[PDB]
């Protein structure tokens, strides 16, 4: 039941700031510490510092002690990161996790992207990819949505609002030239099913506030 | 600081094979305070081994945990298709430092990939471009070509591809190839194919649509 859960990622410009929150839940908040990692695109896994919620006080690794600080609130269970300063090798995945026994993380959130560059949110297009097979053909026919143009990463892709996940690949996002990310998630079904089953692709970009629901359906 | 030296960074191995992963400490490092984590594509490091020796809850026997001298080391004993991750040390002196991770990869026979055809929509005509996604789905190895024709017009440099980690069920790969032309251009020409040539398939296998059903 114990869970953490990191929001406040987006795209920063270059020397700006931003405050990562992160909520745990399902333990007594003051019990543990709590510890940011954070992770850049294809490189290894980075500890920050962390806080004592019972007593207030923060460790930093001496590479961040300047530019972040750690707060925590009791009342709202709740961890923060603020950072300062923030350039183009900050950009990463951040974690928050709990330290437990020993000095182990046994619980991680699912970590937030935190993008330093100096371009401008946008949000994605979604269009349907229909299926391959008519309802009264045989075997399977694969379906999908593609996300276009948006910046910065990522973005989050549930089929029928997560109901549907077995036969799912929501590819990497490829960086087009015009600067702006986009991929394509696919999903295999039998294809006597697209008489029965409504499909809908749920692409939620939180960098923009962009919600958007496609349904699938067979074309022409 | 102490580092941790993790090798390899990289390996491949067969389902059933034994795989060590070694993690060398610069200085002293306490048993108790060196860890071990998984972290599988897309998600948070899960952990695996705590205090050099012991599982942590909800892991499999094969995984064990020892250590030699400042050389810690992380054992699968029986490779897993589900044990496809970058593992992690990570040693606790105050401050914490991990190591910088062992990608392991799954070897397994030749799967043909499925190749299904997708056409722009007419939603995303309307705005001014096209799109057409070629899909390959559910084969090894990953090398693929995928070569786009239209009217047996071989493009070249207007395609781009995009490809997923191997599956933590069976270890195969997808690929999707995007070919995106103006809607001018889309309207100028009838039948759109992608061709695949991989080693799954004894003649190169090709997709194609007429625009206009």
């Known amino acids: 039941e114990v869970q953490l859960v990191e929001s406040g990622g987006g795209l920063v410009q270059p020397g700006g700031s931003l405050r990562l929150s992160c909520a745990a839940s399902?333990?007594?908040?003051?019990?543990?510490?709590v510890h940011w990692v954070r992770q850049a695109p294809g490189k290894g896994l980075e500890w920050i510092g962390g806080?004592?919620?019972?007593?207030?006080?923060?460790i930093f690794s001496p590479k961040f002690k300047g530019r972040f600080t750690i707060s925590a609130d009791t009342s709202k269970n709740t961890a923060y990161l603020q950072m300062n300063s923030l350039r183009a090798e900050d950009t990463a995945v951040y974690y928050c996790?709990?330290?437990?026994?020993?000095?182990?993380?046994?619980?991680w959130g699912q970590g937030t992207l935190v993008t330093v560059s100096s371009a401008s949110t946008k949000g994605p297009s979604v269009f349907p990819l229909a299926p391959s097979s008519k309802s009264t053909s045989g075997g399977t026919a694969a379906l999908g949505c593609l996300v276009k143009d948006y910046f910065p990463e990522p973005v989050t892709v549930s089929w029928n609002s997560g109901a549907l996940t077995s036969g799912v690949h929501t590819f990497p996002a490829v960086l087009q030239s015009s600067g702006l990310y986009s991929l394509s998630s696919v999903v295999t079904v039998p294809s006597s099913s697209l008489g029965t089953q409504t499909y809908i692709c749920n692409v939620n970009h939180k960098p923009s506030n962009t919600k958007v629901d496609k349904k699938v359906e067979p074309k022409s | 600081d102490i580092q941790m030296t993790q090798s390899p960074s990289s390996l491949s191995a067969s389902v059933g094979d034994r795989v060590t992963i070694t993690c060398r400490a610069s200085?002293?490092?306490?048993?108790?305070?060196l860890h071990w984590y998984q972290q599988k594509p897309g998600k948070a490091p899960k952990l695996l081994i705590y205090?050099?020796?012991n599982l942590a809850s909800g892991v499999p026997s094969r995984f064990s945990g020892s250590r030699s001298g400042t050389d810690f080391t992380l054992t699968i004993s029986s490779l897993q298709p589900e044990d496809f991750a970058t593992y992690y040390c990570?040693?606790?002196?105050?401050?914490?430092?991990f190591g910088q991770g062992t990608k392991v990869e799954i070897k397994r026979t030749v799967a043909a990939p499925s190749v299904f055809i997708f056409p722009p929509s007419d939603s995303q005509l309307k705005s001014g471009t096209a799109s057409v996604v070629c899909l390959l789905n559910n084969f090894y190895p990953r090398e693929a070509k995928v070569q786009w024709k239209v009217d047996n017009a071989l493009q070249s440099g207007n395609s781009q591809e995009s490809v997923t980690e191997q599956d933590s069920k069976d270890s195969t790969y997808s690929l999707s190839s995007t070919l995106t032309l103006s809607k001018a251009d889309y309207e100028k020409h009838k039948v759109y194919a992608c061709e695949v040539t991989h080693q799954g398939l004894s003649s190169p296998v090709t997709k194609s649509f007429n625009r206009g059903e």
């Open positions: 990570q040693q606790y002196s105050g401050y914490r430092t």
């Open positions: 996790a709990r330290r437990a026994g020993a000095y182990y993380f046994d619980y």
């Open positions: 200085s002293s490092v306490s048993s108790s305070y």
């Open positions: 205090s050099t020796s």
């Open positions: 399902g333990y007594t908040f003051t019990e543990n510490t």
């Open positions: 806080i004592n919620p019972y007593y207030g006080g923060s």
